Amino acid sequence: VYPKALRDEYIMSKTLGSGACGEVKLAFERKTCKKVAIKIISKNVETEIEILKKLNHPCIIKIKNFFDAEDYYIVLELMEGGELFDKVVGNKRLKEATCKLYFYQMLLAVQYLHENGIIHRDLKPENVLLSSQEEDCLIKITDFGHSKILGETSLMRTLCGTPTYLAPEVLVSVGTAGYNRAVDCWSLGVILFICLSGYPPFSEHRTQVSLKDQITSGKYNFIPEVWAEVSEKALDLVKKLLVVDPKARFTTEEALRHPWLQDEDMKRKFQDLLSEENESTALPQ
Amino acid sequence: VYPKALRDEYIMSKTLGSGACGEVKLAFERKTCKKVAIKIISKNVETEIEILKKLNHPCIIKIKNFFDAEDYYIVLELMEGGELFDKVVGNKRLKEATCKLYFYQMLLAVQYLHENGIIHRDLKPENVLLSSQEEDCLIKITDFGHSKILGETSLMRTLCGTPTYLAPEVLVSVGTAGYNRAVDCWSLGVILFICLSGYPPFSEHRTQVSLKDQITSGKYNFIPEVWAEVSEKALDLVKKLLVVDPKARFTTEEALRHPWLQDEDMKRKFQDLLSEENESTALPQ
Numbered sequence A, B: 001v002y003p004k005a006l007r008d009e010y011i012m013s014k015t016l017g018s019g020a021c022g023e024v025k026l027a028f029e030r031k032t033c034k035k036v037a038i039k040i041i042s043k044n045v046e047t048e049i050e051i052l053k054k055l056n057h058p059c060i061i062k063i064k065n066f067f068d069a070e071d072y073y074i075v076l077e078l079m080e081g082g083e084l085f086d087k088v089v090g091n092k093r094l095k096e097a098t099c100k101l102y103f104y105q106m107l108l109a110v111q112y113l114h115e116n117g118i119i120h121r122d123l124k125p126e127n128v129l130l131s132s133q134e135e136d137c138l139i140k141i142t143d144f145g146h147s148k149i150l151g152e153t154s155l156m157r158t159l160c161g162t163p164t165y166l167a168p169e170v171l172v173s174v175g176t177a178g179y180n181r182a183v184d185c186w187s188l189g190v191i192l193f194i195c196l197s198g199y200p201p202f203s204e205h206r207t208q209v210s211l212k213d214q215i216t217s218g219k220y221n222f223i224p225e226v227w228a229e230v231s232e233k234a235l236d237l238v239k240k241l242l243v244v245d246p247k248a249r250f251t252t253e254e255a256l257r258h259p260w261l262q263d264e265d266m267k268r269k270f271q272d273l274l275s276e277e278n279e280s281t282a283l284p285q
């Protein structure tokens, strides 16, 4: 049975989805009679909730409520469009315009995370939720289970002293430290590749090369026929995100300044979708 | 003034030492009238205490009491010999025999840490305490302020899934992961070098090469005249600990099996010092 304090506030309904350690249910908030989603995580979820309670961005999910019972229950706003995964599965692909709208929002979300010292580390189509069943909708990033808070590092503390007794490998790691966030830009690149083409850049399908070797050489699977209808600009961005050196890789800022995203129609549609979502209280002047 | 709960149990006395964020005082336990040391740390000290409360080895300091007040107060057994630092400062050097006794204990201490999933990360002569003012004494490792508990890593969790969306640098790091403990073997190597020779292997004294370059090339400063009186075996061990590749570096096990430590007289003296320290309760048979 559901925990009493959850049943007290919400009437639980049908299943909307079902992940590995969890499941998502439709619920009705008793006070308002409005629909919510409730994510169940079976037994640092509590610290995932505190990360998410701090963040305030339209393209990142918000926690409405939380119950820590036999299992964890996370209440959030309904995302009726479901997962992005379902739009790209089975070689389905989105219009290039729709890819741009979605991707712009993802970049804004992840930029906001990185500005706020948070790395997601598990960006995938499964973790991108769509607001509605309409093509032109808002998206939100979810599932912060693998996320990490950037702070003062062990390395930074060590380098304040004299390294008389310090191991060489620690000194060598200074070259590449502080680029953990680049893992999210790589994932975005892979997500963009999938959205534009309907297939994954790295995959064991009809190849001899190991997945690991595909990834570390950066040699994505390019099938000209699938890509011919896609613009050069969109593929150019993909290529700047799938750079194997994390220091040369495009950051979210660099991506947002890329020609592919200098598209005032797309941006207008995003802004229009935002005000439509919003319900403010009346302003002076 | 000292906190009331500390004054309740102990009478505070003279200063024995004074580190950067702290100071060490002589105290008398009221109940027993026996001497203790009290380390003051001015404001994860509390988790350093919990690490130390779990460990049980004769060459690692034990916490007798702890007070978290305006400052932190850590009560421990008196180590009347003081810091090892003071035995090696000003180009002073220990007899080779004394170096072996001390170093054997350090290896046993650090082996015990690594077997128990703890890396110290700040092994230095300042953090080695001596039991008595006699040459042949027990030593204890102290100051676990930079220590880290080894556990299930982010990497291990990532590698359980398929790396479709995983950045190449994460896959590359698999080659060298799980060798963090080797930093302690390097420090031990530096400590041994200093003990045997009376001077530091890496240092900015009369050289053009930067400290960092000295360390990452592993090119220690070898002065033949200082070393001529030291055995080949002792220097051979030093060289196997000051290896720049952390995977080729000697572990504490490898060091303990080194010819330099196959010395039954040294080991006899260690065992004799242990039973002397100990006060058991009577045994059946």
Ligand SMILES: C/C(=N\Nc1ncc[nH]1)c1ccc(NC(=O)c2cc3cccc([N+](=O)[O-])c3[nH]2)cc1
Pocket (backbone or CB within 6 Å): A016, A017, A021, A022, A024, A037, A039, A041, A045, A048, A074, A076, A077, A078, A079, A080, A081, A082, A083, A129, A142, A143, A144, A145
């Ligand atoms: C925060 C979180 N997971 N965190 C963790 N932490 C460790 C494992 N999961 C979520 C994971 C998935 C979530 N999914 C949904 O809200 C959702 C999925 C879904 C599928 C179809 C339809 C809807 N819907 O709201 O209409 C849907 N909503 C929401 C939250």
Ligand SMILES: C/C(=N\Nc1ncc[nH]1)c1ccc(NC(=O)c2cc3cccc([N+](=O)[O-])c3[nH]2)cc1
Pocket (backbone or CB within 6 Å): B016, B017, B021, B022, B024, B037, B039, B041, B045, B048, B074, B076, B077, B078, B079, B080, B081, B082, B083, B129, B142, B143, B144, B145
């Ligand atoms: C646990 C710890 N420090 N932890 C942390 N954590 C962040 C910064 N320090 C210690 C650091 C140093 C300690 N030093 C001593 O007990 C000590 C130093 C010293 C010097 C001369 C004589 C004695 N003595 O006990 O007779 C001495 N005892 C003891 C504990």
